[model samples]
Target chain A: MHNHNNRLVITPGEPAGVGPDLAITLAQQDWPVELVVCADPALLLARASQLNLPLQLREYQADQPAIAQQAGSLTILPVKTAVNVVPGKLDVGNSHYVVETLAKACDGAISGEFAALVTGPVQKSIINDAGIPFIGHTEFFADRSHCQRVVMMLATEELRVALATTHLPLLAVPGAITQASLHEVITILDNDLKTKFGITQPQIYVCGLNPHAGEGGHMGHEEIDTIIPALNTLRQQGINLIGPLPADTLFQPKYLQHADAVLAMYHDQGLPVLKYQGFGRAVNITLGLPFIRTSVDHGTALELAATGTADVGSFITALNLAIKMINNS
Target chain B: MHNHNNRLVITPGEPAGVGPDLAITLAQQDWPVELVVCADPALLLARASQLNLPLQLREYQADQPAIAQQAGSLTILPVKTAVNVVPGKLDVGNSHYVVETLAKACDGAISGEFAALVTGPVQKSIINDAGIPFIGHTEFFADRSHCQRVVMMLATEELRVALATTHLPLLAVPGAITQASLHEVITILDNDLKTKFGITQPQIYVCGLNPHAGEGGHMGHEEIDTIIPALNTLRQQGINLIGPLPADTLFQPKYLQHADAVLAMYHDQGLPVLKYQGFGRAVNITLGLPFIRTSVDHGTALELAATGTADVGSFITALNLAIKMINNS
Candidate 1:
């Protein structure tokens, strides 16, 4: 049971980057979802013309699902910006435009008008330079959706990895990895797998925060104090989970097949595998959100913007995965 | 010119594991190196017969290269152990046999009697059960060869990744990554890439130990203080290198093609990508050794020992890559 006319809201991220180009390429595909693009209409049209692709623009309203169904026809939500967007220049003056597009899409999603929200990449530095209080897209959405906690997962067809702490220093990781923090990750994963992913009794695998999982404390003692206690608590709660296995050996087929999702202690420890598996085809999903939201696992590539050379594989995967999540829920 | 009759040294690690069976299967291959196995001959033959294969054993002396170059024949270094070699059970009594094989291989390799040492997997716990010192194969080799510092690298045809540290706790990684240690890694890489790998001017790419390499010190400060200074100092010394780059986007074909070698900051931060690219076909190489050495990237499967199902893909790749290293040097 699939709905071909389901309305999906798209946020083509920074105007100066390849977001416009990837969105244009994605528009040419024979996708079933009607894309309500919340971005600068000038940027989109300019990039589309540069790529010699025609896109028909219609003023977007949250209520209409079928109006933007045609390949050439797209629903536009224009954001007023101060500076003109060139292909390679990232100016702080137009930073408000990026924030507006995200707010519009997130607002629509929270109100239940859109089936799911799919986002492109944004230039964080530009946003920060413009004096906008920005952390990351995940944190931004988490705050907007009033999500107290969120887990960032990078996924492909082959592997799915979730991180407990991201963007933290290496020294900070050991102290930051509290027993409660580990439990929170497992709890989010436990709930997300069954509710969002449609797994009935999902078995989640946890990776040790330490190398060789601390090699029985010969390498590190976090496994003895932090990770093991948290795992023991979860085991008593009857959560179907396995680990703190050595992160190095956890990705083989034997362990991966049993896991609905794999959790790592930190960012770089887990992401190399996900990036290797997904490469240009991976999507970043924020779990424990009230609404279904997924993003492409790339940044704003200004060099490829307006050139029509950007790949839309991750975006397409994100859209399809979002649809599945909506239907599963 | 390839010599098909030179006796290559094969060391079946943990006499209680599947090393004997794998070695016997390797004997079945058409390797150019002579098969001078540094293990008890009876153990290998027993596994071969158990697996319904036939093997021939002949004692080889170190000085006679031409006389020892006979294919399909195994040279024995028989070291007697306390317990009988068991198929499924890990016998502590046979721990000395594994250690002795590695020692003999190291000696032979230093003497140029063996082209390279190909080691099978060893069980550390059982080795410890024998109340003997057994940390890992790499450490054992380093100590035996009198090498003070060595870098561990795993490679396929396309990518080569070397580690700055190995077998250390995750918590200690931050402290271990000093300017001196960073220089130690690059110095070895600089010398070996030219001397051993035949790259006259090697372009080494180093990753920031932290996520986003500490996001320019907002997330972590190690990159700004320790890593970048080390790279700059090395650069002034006429070393061709690029990085402290973010590990996330470093693996694309464009970046990978430009990099002669990638020096990762820690173990888990680096290995997943290498293993993902070359699992079952990766070669583990030790740089800074007085001589060339390469081994398999997996452990001894005790349950599957004495069975014909042991995989030799890693062994084959190791041998081929080792030969390339020697020839290029």
Candidate 2:
């Protein structure tokens, strides 16, 4: 007997990249939840054949029992590709196939047909070249689900860091850091920790917009004028917030031990440190979504496909995290 | 017998802080070169007494043979303190004493009276409160030496990260990054790596100012407008430079294995990652000075002063680096 009725939807993004290879590698492991990969059966068959791995594919049925996924087998929801894939060569012709897979998997998660969504790496440039107005996975999900705001968080076994202003120029980061923006990011972050991670009262430590948290307004005024005020407003609403602290010092053991997650002001300020700690074992999770979503922290290594040389650590970690999140809920 | 003829001046930066405690702890170890400490002799004696450690001090004579510093003694070039220090307290009266020690030690290094200078941490707020117009150790050294510019680098055993912008508002960092500034910073970094660290041909890896090295001009134009042009000019002058690469990816082993040093665009971008890797064992080194200077990579822990529980790892690392630089020269 199984604990849950729904399966977890896995999307192997960027067909010409290592996404299919990672999916094949992960299918070899036995999982607690039904691992329903939302990809074309032909792509899996070809990738498995190339890597010399045994893969038994079964089409997912809506009213079937939630059977545990077996080693060397996969339960897949078939989504057809526009063209056949050559492992290392990119085809703009097949980009639409990749986006379509994500959309189907997302729909399953939204409808509670899937417990969560686990995404593989995707090449954004190729997707754009294919005439799709795609920015990133996080944004695509947000727009598709009609989410007003979303939080981008990356996690390893030890740490979770969320960004306040992501994908902006270093020069534009300061201006984007406003009270309204911070309030939205934090509210979403706080709610997600409670709803997803099972933490009743999440304690968030926020990094100052400036170094040394603006060195008390000598370096920048965002901390004094913007961050502090925003944080205070959140605190009044019963949110447990810690800083506006220096990004560097807040990462130390004393502060991290007390924090559920750290909110960094910009990408470089937060991510470099987290990635250094994570190495190749990090997972990217999109918070504030109506459903749970996690991703591989690395990009598509196009050349490593079919050679069986690509490391599957991040992919496995992503699956494990999604399972953990599902069980907690 | 000492291996070197010149002494290395050691400055215990803040009297009422852990700087003196680290100095006393390091003085207990035997050193290869003459270690001359610049501070009031009474202060060292008092700190040693408080920590229950034995102390022996001898006056430095310019004409005497360079003797190896013994486990229980320090060669002293005494500078008088204005007042007696109380541990865990900051006094404006003693700020001048700290300044005097740095000035005397720097003067010695400038005149070749010492081979190098090893500094402990100082409290910037206290120094500024005392109305001395103090900035940081690196800036102080550059101004005192009358050098137009200097490079600040923090190093552990494995990594070296030099910053383009040291102390500025996060907003101001973008404007500070210009062709003229990068040319100067990189030029100094390359020359110092060759002349001071004994690298025959230093291969420097530079980081982009923006998140993804400006994502090829989509995030920011600094990489296209300023960084690339400056780097091209440096390459023309036969300086082997690698990037303007993504700050996140540049720190990985594939890049770090081949890099002599990494040049970061700002403080938070580089130091947080470096300090995280270092734990408490990093050393701050100032390049482009006339003589070598290295300092402990921590602040003054006032309460830990003479408590005998303060860690001396960073202080020891600073001393080891100074000795290494001297021997390399």
Candidate 3:
């Protein structure tokens, strides 16, 4: 308890995107814990100027005790970009610098310098365009922490959904959903829901790989060959799991009301209902990590950048969710 | 105009199932068009007795002019079952009887003797067990009508969703999502939304085959290779199609309000959101058939047959939708 730090670090990814714009808006509110903005202070200044928002910044001092966030102000843990950012434009030279902010925030969280990490959107295409091999934020953090498997779950205030498989093509999703893989994903989901979210013996509802969950293999054999077997093993281990129910019907209130979390078989299979239910309030949370991590469910909307038209609801929700997770942890 | 009939036929599929239970409840209300129930009177009497509901029946006379449906009554087109039916049980001996009811409804519909057909839930496994080849209500109607391609669409009062591929395993979904298949599905969807829905130049929003619509091919190639090419052809033909949007975000109100109908690439991708949105009020309709055919979105819940507690929302919605389609056609 003596070593505990209540501070949280946030990475405003992609200076050319609205991440910086949203970061500037963070200064408009008072928060329970200090937010360590890990990005170029100059980028924030430029976006603040573009939006004509009142802003004040103080360089973050790690030696100092955590200060509660003040309105109209931010504390910067400055990571400099190579080039001046122009809104809605991508620069390859500055792309490498964007990743550095993520590294600094991740490193701080690992050392317990920060209680949790909140990330903004980063365009994976631009990072790869810069000749950097990057899969996603979740994969990057997993590799850095040497975590073998991480669960990607999105949560709104009403519901939580974890994916057994994340970011795979619809075609590849079938091949990736083996018994062993489901075991890993469900274990991580179950453990994290208990440890991180403070739900003891979390009641997880699972969706099937097929439309009617194979309808006894009339449509697909995965539920018969893999999901059922995996779920049987999971239940025997004292994990309270329900279904290999049809994805179409499983999402309805009768089933969803009892679930602490829903485990969707694949990406598109689960997320459409969640995002629709969330109504722009969805926050992407990464579980099975050593530290609490939350992110905006949206992408870097470059077109809305500089125009001060970017909807900051998802970003605000992500930050708020991270703080809530911190309190729970 | 001379061939138009104002009589709608209802097939209470699976006599031992809740289709009969719900069929008894239908007598509690009055309808605009004549309600023809093509089922054995013995099954209806047994179910009505079990549920303690009043039911009056008269044989459907094709030569007589149509009469508005009277309350507490239905026009019966008797198709006898092979043996005595026990509620909550599926009998192979009685399976052929269920198909006979469907045949009578479909045949009457094709010959313009009935304005539309509304079907109840049938257990496909039992029908197959009886040594008869049957896929689904939709496919059976398609084959009999000699339609080359048929689209499966589900709708509530607010939204209509059509599927490009139906009833395939997740693994087979991508392989089936070719340009030709999409072209067929979208064309049928476009035409039906206009003719049956009475929407002139209906604007259809289509979901991509992958998550984030493959995020510009960072995740999958089907969006780049097939969906885009097919949509391009559709646009040139003035179909007014929007998207290849991410299924997750495409379901939200901002997009859904503008969409005349949403064309999902597969069953699970679209139906989960629609079913969730419908909240038991969903109606399943088959497009590209020569005659209007609608069915209840749920299957035969054999357990709910004699319980006197089956929810009749979906079946009522299906019948209502068919009547609306009849008026539109």
Q: Give the candidate number with the greatest lDDT.
A: 3
TM-score of every candidate: 0.93, 0.96, 0.92
lDDT against the true structure, per candidate, is 0.80, 0.88, 0.89
Residue B64 error, candidate 3, Å: 3.6
Candidate 3 C-alpha lDDT tens digits along B1-329? 22457899999999889999888898789999999999999899878989988888988898998889888889999999999999988899998899999988999999889989999999998999989999798888888788888888999989999999888888899999888898888988898887777788899999998988998898999999999999999999999988999998899888899999999999999999888778888999999988888889888999889798898999899898888888875
Q: A-chain TM-score per prediction?
A: 0.92, 0.96, 0.95
DockQ list for all candidates: 0.63, 0.70, 0.76
Each model's fraction of native contacts: 0.61, 0.67, 0.87
Residue range A74-184, candidate 2, lDDT tens digits = 898998888878998889988998999999988878778888999999998889998999988888998899988988998887889999989999889989988899989
Cα distance off (Å), candidate 3, residue B297: 1.4
**Measured by C-alpha RMSD in angstroms, how accurate is candidate 1?**
3.0
Query: Which portions of model 1 miss their true places by more than 4 Å?
Result: A1-5, A65-68, A79-84, A91-93, B1-7, B67-71, B77-83, B125-131
| lDDT score at residue B108, model 2, on the 0-100 scale | 83
Candidate 2's DockQ is 0.70
For model 2, how does the per-residue alpha-carbon lDDT over B175-198 read when each residue is reduced to its tens digit? 999999998999889888877787
Ranking by lDDT: 3, 2, 1
- Most DockQ-accurate candidate: 3
Query: Which pairs clash in the backbone of model 1?
Result: B5-B69, B6-B33, B6-B34, B7-B34, B7-B35, B8-B34, B18-B305, B121-B300
